[PDB]
Design a protein around this ligand. Structure first.
Ligand code: 14H
Length: 236
């Protein structure tokens, strides 16, 4: 890439590829707090100076869609309002490259506290597979940056985030005369969110809200991808 954020991008992608994919089922620092179908949501309870920082990690398996398609839909701001429910307003501050943009958005008051805004670079990347026996990996990384055109606000507390949707397509070609259809593909998703609320709020409530809102998002967003891609040619 040309843009000034290319080095930071690579470091964020690499951290997610090494630390975010790590299996969290047997990790006793993590707690499985939501299960429904193929979806599991885990959290690690962390606070600094009384501020709840709990890392969130979800895993999902979604039939009939690819990692490329799920990542495309997650990244593409032209469809954000089709699925996102926690945002009041957003706009693109800057386009850095064809796969990378900076976004400013304000969120609905889902917490018992001042309204939050966030200012993040959103980038979509493909990580090639080492062999044709393995899945290619598609990732969208959303991470807080600074921008002159979006300074701190009077009205909102500036949250900071480090989020990744990491997706891999598994395929199971059919036995004989049939061509591959969407019944033969499944997308494995890992979604990780590390959110700094930028100020204090009761932890009990913040945790209740995260337990509610992330599984809600994931079900609605993945369903939306399934609907919008149904009966379409598969994008690997
Ligand atoms: C910025 C803190 C204010 C929101 C408080 C938490 C609400 C839970 C949101 C669940 C849905 C996450 C959807 C999600 O991942 N959304 C994208 C696109 O809007 C931006 C994102 O990477 C993010 C993650 C987490 C918080 C805000 C924004």
């Amino acid at each position: 890439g040309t843009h000034r954020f290319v080095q930071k991008v690579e470091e964020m992608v690499q951290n997610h590829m090494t630390y975010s994919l790590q299996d969290v089922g047997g990790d006793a620092n993590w707690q499985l707090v939501v299960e429904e179908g193929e979806m599991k949501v885990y959290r690690r309870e962390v606070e600094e100076n009384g501020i709840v920082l709990d890392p969130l990690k979800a895993t999902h398996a979604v039939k009939g869609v690819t990692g490329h398609e799920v990542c495309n839909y997650f990244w593409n701001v032209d469809v954000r309002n089709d699925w996102e429910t926690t945002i009041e307003n957003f706009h693109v501050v800057e386009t850095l490259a064809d796969n990378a943009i900076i976004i400013y958005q304000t969120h609905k008051r889902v917490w018992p506290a001042s309204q939050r805004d966030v200012l993040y670079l959103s980038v979509i990347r493909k990580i090639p597979a080492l062999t044709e026996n393995d899945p290619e990996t598609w990732i969208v990384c959303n991470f807080s940056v600074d921008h002159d055109s979006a300074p701190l606000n009077n009205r909102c507390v500036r949250a900071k985030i480090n989020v990744a949707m990491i997706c891999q397509t598994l395929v199971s070609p059919p036995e004989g005369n049939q061509e591959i259809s969407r019944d033969n593909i499944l997308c494995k998703i890992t979604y990780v969110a590390n959110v700094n609320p930028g100020g204090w709020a009761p932890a009990s409530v913040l945790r209740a809200v995260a337990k509610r809102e992330y599984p809600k998002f994931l079900k609605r967003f993945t369903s939306y991808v399934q609907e919008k891609t149904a009966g379409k040619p598969i994008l690997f």
